[PDB]
Structures are given as C-alpha cells and as structure tokens.
Amino acid sequence: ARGVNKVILVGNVGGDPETRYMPNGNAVTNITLATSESWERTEWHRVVFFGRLAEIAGEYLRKGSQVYVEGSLRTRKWQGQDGQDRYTTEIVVDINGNMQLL
Amino acid sequence: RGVNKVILVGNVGGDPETRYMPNGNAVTNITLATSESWERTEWHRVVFFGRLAEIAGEYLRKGSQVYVEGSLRTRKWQGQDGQDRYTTEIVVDINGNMQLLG
Amino acid sequence: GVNKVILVGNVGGDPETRYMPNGNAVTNITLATSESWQQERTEWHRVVFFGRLAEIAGEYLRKGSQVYVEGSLRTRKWQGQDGQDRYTTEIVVDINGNMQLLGG
Amino acid sequence: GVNKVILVGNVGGDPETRYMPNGNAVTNITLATSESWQERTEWHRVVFFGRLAEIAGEYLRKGSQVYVEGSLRTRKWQGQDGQDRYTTEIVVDINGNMQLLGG
Ligand SMILES: O=c1c(O)c(-c2cc(O)c(O)c(O)c2)oc2cc(O)cc(O)c12
Ligand SMILES: O=c1c(O)c(-c2cc(O)c(O)c(O)c2)oc2cc(O)cc(O)c12
C-alpha cells in the first residue's frame, strides 16, 4: 500500500553549498556529495536540504566537509530548452531526515 | 571510504526482467514503487546482481511486496540526440540484501 | 550522533497498549528477526512505540504480524529484586521513527 | 528478517581487543550517541569481529568519532552468579561496516 524510502550517506561535500530562498521564504540548499567504495570508484550524489537543516547545511557545510546525511529519494522530471523530458534523482533531506557535520 | 546505503520497501512494477551476461551470471531489473499517503508514489530502478538476481528473477512478480537494501549508482549516457543523460539506480549485490514480503 | 535501528520481523504476541493520564498511547511488542545458516538463530527485540505510531501499532499489529520498524536504541537501567543492577535495551519508535505493516 | 543498526558517535574509552583460540581478533568499545531537545546521551556496547576488529583496535581511541553499522545480538551470561544476565550488543562483523571519521 505505502512504503519505506530511506537513504543514508557519509561522504565529502563537492563544492560550497548553494542556498536559496523560496518566496515563502523557506531555505533550500543544494550540495553534491561524494562517497567512494574501494575493491576505487567515487559516486556523486545530489543532496537537497529543506527547512531548518537547509539553514544549518548552508551555514556549516563547505567544500571538503565530511557529513552524514539521511533522507529519501525523489526523482524530479524537468524539461531542457529543446523540450524533451529529463529526470534527476535527488536525496531529499527534510524534517523526516537528518544531517550531522562530522 | 564513505557510506552509500539505500533501504526500500515497496511494490514491484512489472515482472522482473532477468538476463545473463557472459560468465554465466544473472542480472535482474525491476522498478519499485514506494508511496507516502498525504498521495505521492515514487518509482525506483532497482537492479540485482549475483545470487540475489536469480532469487529476484525467480520469486518477484508484478505487485510483489519486497524489502531491498542496496547502494546508489548513477550511470551517465549520451542519448541519441547528442545529449548527456543520467540514470540513478539502486544496486543490490553481495553487499546488499533483499527479502520477499508476505 | 546518529542512533538508528531498522528491523523487519514477526511480532511475538499481541501488542500491549496503555494510556497515560494525557492520555497519549504507549504500546509494547516483542519482535523476532531470524538469520538462517545450526539451521536458524532468531533474535527477540523489545520494541516500544509512542504517539501516533503507538495507536497504529496497538490497532493493527497482532501475534504473527510481519512489520517493518525504524527507531532508536534506548537502554534502561534498573535494580532487580536482588538489589542488582539490570539493563534492558529497547527499540524506541516515536515521531523520529517509522513503522509499516507488511503483507496483505 | 532484517536486523540492522547504524550509529555515529564518540568512543567512550580505549578499545579492548583480544584474540581467540584461532587467531581472530575481537575488539570491544562503548559508543556514545546524544540527542539534545537539554541533552540525553546513550551508551552502546559495540563489538567487532574479523578484519574490522583489527582496524577498530588499531585506529579507534577514546574520543574518536566513528560510523558503525551492525546487527543487534542480546547475549545471555552468568558472571558471578550472582545470577544470569543479558546484554544487547551491536555486532559488527563481515556483514556490517565501520568508518573512522574526522580529517
Ligand atoms: O523516518 C523518519 C525519521 O527518521 C524522522 C526524523 C525526524 C527528526 O526530526 C529527527 O531528528 C530524526 O532523527 C528523524 O521523521 C520521520 C517522519 C515521518 O513522518 C516519517 C518517517 O519515516 C520519519
Ligand atoms: O553491509 C554489509 C557488509 O558490509 C558486508 C561485508 C563487510 C565486510 O567488512 C566485508 O569484508 C565483506 O566482504 C562484506 O556483508 C554484508 C552481507 C550481507 O548479507 C548484508 C549486508 O548488509 C552486508
């Protein structure tokens, strides 16, 4: 009927956080997060924070910061300037998730 | 050198597609639906490797409820038009887990 | 830090739910998880729910129900009737956690 | 079923590592996680086996921050009987994971 959709990541922040405000005006910050698994492959994650965690992320995270993150997966549908249909899967960290500077 | 973990419980979207590579090894593919009701449903591309692939292929059907634990991998590809596209999947292999529910 | 527990298993007996003056509900179960490989070892967990999930658990869980549970670990200290220190570690599932009835 | 625990916190004292009749290492720590609402800290008994036991023993120290993923095992034991006692531990072995944090 309904399910579980949970993501946990520990890794290093790719560049400085980009935080912006909606009209509301609630904070949304964006980062990319690198995790690596060795047998080396590194994996880049698009993490987006909302609400209090957005402000905290925006304030405290920097390029190279190590951080723990817990959220859920959302794939957004969007259009390129040729029309078409593109998709991006992100890790949404909001009130139902968590973040910890490490 | 990071943590990259995904846990999902949801219902399988269509019958599993399983195929064999050279080497004699199974890879099965499903889509998995998770929903949070106040309703939004989220579709996940899950791909299994190794023993779990055979087990998935054999036991999962359209509508099956299943628990899944894997890690996120986004694959880059050029679409027929010149463009870069990305597909993020949940890889469930020896480091992950699956459990048929019901 | 982070303190997180995820369990899928079968409920051991009927839930025991009770209400405080407030009221607010608290329900208790035991939950069995097994790893098979001996031929199986089963592990018994003391899970306790608070708030909305407590009512939902109380209502919907029964002996034998399969359920998913996400909470955090709390270990309670107590003196037993021999005067000795005892400890009980529970999985607390509250507003920060989650529960999902499985099957149909 | 599924029996999974994930913790991030600070190690309570130096790790205690010991070796078994074979050669295999087992190391023990306590791990503190805290939530402020103004604060409650929770102490976890974590026990490592195999490679992670050696890595834990070598690299973890009092105050180290670490990520840990394991499963819950409650052990029965006598000790002094006295009486029989029970202790729930987080077992981190080949099916789990650990990551030293900080840099
Ligand atoms: O899984 C969940 C979860 O973890 C939290 C959460 C919230 C916090 O404010 C925390 O600090 C925290 O650690 C967890 O909320 C939730 C709320 C839901 O409606 C449903 C969920 O499934 C979760
Ligand atoms: O999460 C897991 C994990 O880390 C390992 C693992 C850990 C090590 O330290 C190793 O050297 C290794 O080969 C595997 O096995 C697993 C096996 C499962 O069935 C399920 C899991 O979730 C894990």
Atom of ligand 2 nearest to the CA of D51: 9
Q: How far apart are CA B67 and CA D3, in angstroms?
A: 12
- Which helix (H) or strand (E) covers residue A5, if one does? strand A4-13
CA B76 distance to own-chain centroid: 17
- Note whether D32 and D10 are within 8 A (CB): yes
Q: Which site among C66, C70, C99, C101 would you substitute to test the B interface, given the most B Cβ atoms closer than 10 Å to its Cβ?
A: C66
Q: Is the peptide bond before C83 cis (omega within 30 degrees of 0)?
A: no
Chain pair C-D, CB pairs under 8 angstroms:
80
Q: For residues D4 and C5, is the Cβ–Cβ distance under 8 A?
A: yes
Domain containing residue C15: CATH number = 2.40.50.140
Q: Measure A62 CA to ligand 1 centroid, in angstroms.
A: 25
Give the count of Cβ contacts less than 8 A between chain A and D: 15
The structure was resolved experimentally with X-ray
Alpha-carbon span D16 to D45, nearest angstrom: 12
CA-based end-to-end distance of chain B: 36
Give the amino acid at C66. Q
The torsion of the CA quartet B68, D26, D74, C50, rounded to 10 degrees, works out to: -60
| Chain C partners within 8 Å of A53 (Cβ) | none
| CB atoms D8 and A66 under 8 Å | no
Measured torsion, CA atoms of residues C53, C75, A52, A9, in degrees rounded to the nearest 10? -100
Verify whether the Cβ–Cβ distance D99 to B2 is below 8 Å: yes
The protein residue whose alpha carbon is closest to atom 6 in ligand 1 is: C96
Residues of chain C positioned with their CB less than 8 A from the CB of D4:
5-7
C-alpha torsion C65→C94→A70→D56, nearest 10 = -90
Residues 6+ away with beta carbon under 8 Å from C97: C53, C69, C70, C71, C72
Measure in Å the smallest separation between the Cα of A41 and chain C Cα atoms: 26
CB contact under 8 A, D42 and C73: yes
Residue whose C-alpha is closest to residue C1's, from D34, D66, D37? D34
Chain A partners of D101 at a C-beta cutoff of 8 Å? Answer: 10, 66, 102
Distance from CA of residue B25 to its chain's centroid?
Answer: 16
- Judged by CB atoms closer than 8 Å, whether chains meet at D83 and C82 is answered as yes
Indicate which ligand has the atom closest to the C-alpha of B4.
2
For residue B88, give the nearest of A3, A8, A89 by CB distance. Answer: A89
- Supply B1's token pair: 């050198």
Tokens for D50, please give them: 């195999």
Interface of B with D (CB under 8 A): 1-3, 5, 7, 67, 69, 97, 99
Q: Which domain holds residue C72?
A: 1-104
- Cα gap B65→A39, rounded to integer Å: 32
User: Which has the closest alpha carbon to B31: B52, B51, B8?
Assistant: B8
Q: Closest Cα to residue A88, out of A73, A77, A80? A: A77
Q: Domain count for chain D, please give it.
A: 1
Strands (E) across D2-39 are located at 2-11, 16-19, 25-35
Instruction: For chain A, give percent helix, strand, coil, nearest 5.
Output: 10, 65, 25
* CA dist., res. A43 & res. A45, Å (int): 7
Contacts of D6 in chain B (CB under 8 A): 5
